[PDB]
Amino acid sequence: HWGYGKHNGPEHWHKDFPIAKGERQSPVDIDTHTAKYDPSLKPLSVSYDQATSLRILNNGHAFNVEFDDSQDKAVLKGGPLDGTYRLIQFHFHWGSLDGQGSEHTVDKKKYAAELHLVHWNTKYGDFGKAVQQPDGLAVLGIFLKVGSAKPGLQKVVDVLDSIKTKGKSADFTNFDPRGLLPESLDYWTYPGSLTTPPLLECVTWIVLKEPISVSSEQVLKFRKLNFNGEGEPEELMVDNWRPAQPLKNRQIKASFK
Numbered sequence: 001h002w003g004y005g006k007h008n009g010p011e012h013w014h015k016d017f018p019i020a021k022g023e024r025q026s027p028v029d030i031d032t033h034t035a036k037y038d039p040s041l042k043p044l045s046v047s048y049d050q051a052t053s054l055r056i057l058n059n060g061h062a063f064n065v066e067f068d069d070s071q072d073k074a075v076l077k078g079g080p081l082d083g084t085y086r087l088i089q090f091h092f093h094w095g096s097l098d099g100q101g102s103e104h105t106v107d108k109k110k111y112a113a114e115l116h117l118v119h120w121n122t123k124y125g126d127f128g129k130a131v132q133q134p135d136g137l138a139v140l141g142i143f144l145k146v147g148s149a150k151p152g153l154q155k156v157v158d159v160l161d162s163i164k165t166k167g168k169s170a171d172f173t174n175f176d177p178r179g180l181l182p183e184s185l186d187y188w189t190y191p192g193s194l195t196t197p198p199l200l201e202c203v204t205w206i207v208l209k210e211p212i213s214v215s216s217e218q219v220l221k222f223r224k225l226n227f228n229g230e231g232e233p234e235e236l237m238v239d240n241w242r243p244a245q246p247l248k249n250r251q252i253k254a255s256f257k
């Protein structure tokens with residue numbers, strides 16, 4: 001149903017998902033001058049050393065690397081969070097050109113792509129319960145800029161050939177998500193939602209200020225993915241991002257000054 005085309009893109013979402021015009025929708029523009037430094041903000045605790053990746057699959061919207069979240073293998077704690085959040089999957093949003101692709105912007109600036117490491121609040125038992133809570137999910141957002149190649153990203157880039165079309169999946173075990181992290185864990189944080197339908201407002205967004213760079217050839221491989229399934233007319237998977245939403249009654253807190 002929903003997609004990123006003129007006929008079923010972000011502008012049409014509200015018809016099937018009314019929360020699209022809700023009070024805490026993401027992504028948002030991060031205005032750095034009016035964001036508030038908060039000294040009571042704890043540092044992030046990202047423990048991804050016991051992470052266990054399982055699959056990589058094209059879902060017609062993006063490609064997702066899924067992880068085993070049956071136990072606290074890769075968790076997120078600290079920062080503005082209270083409780084442990086488990087990594088269940090990560091995905092990217094990218095554009096058809098280097099000047100677009102990220103969902104969140106910084107002072108209106110768009111990056112080439114954006115990585116979202118999705119975590120769910122373990123106090124809720126399972127992911128399905130978590131998406132029914134205002135503090136059910138924590139998504140770590142990381143910006144990707146085009147520059148030098150990101151070593152930890154190549155393994156993902158290589159397997160894209162086997163998951164070109166919608167519905168395809170491939171085994172993708174022993175992948176270390178720590179290769180996708182910037183050097184600094186400084187961040188901005190605000191209450192928001194999923195950036196794609198069902199557009200649920202259960203997310204505490206933690207967007208890192210430091211982006212990671214990837215070569216144009218690495219992000220180039222992203223653009224050869226297909227929205228369509230095999231045997232269907234080809235649709236390049238590009239621009240799978242949602243425009244910034246009004247901040248409304250919200251303030252973005254910074255962990256740095």
Ligand SMILES: COc1cccc(N2C=Cc3cc(S(N)(=O)=O)sc3S2(=O)=O)c1
Nearest residue numbers: 116118131139193194195196197198200
């Ligand atoms: C009942 O809601 C469900 C159930 C199962 C999966 C999802 N998901 C859908 C979209 C979606 C978009 C995300 S983003 N771009 O904001 O980080 S994270 C995410 S999801 O958790 O994978 C929602």
Ligand SMILES: [Hg+2]
Nearest residue numbers: 132133201202
């Ligand atoms: Hg929710």
Ligand SMILES: [Zn+2]
Nearest residue numbers: 091093116195
């Ligand atoms: Zn996303």
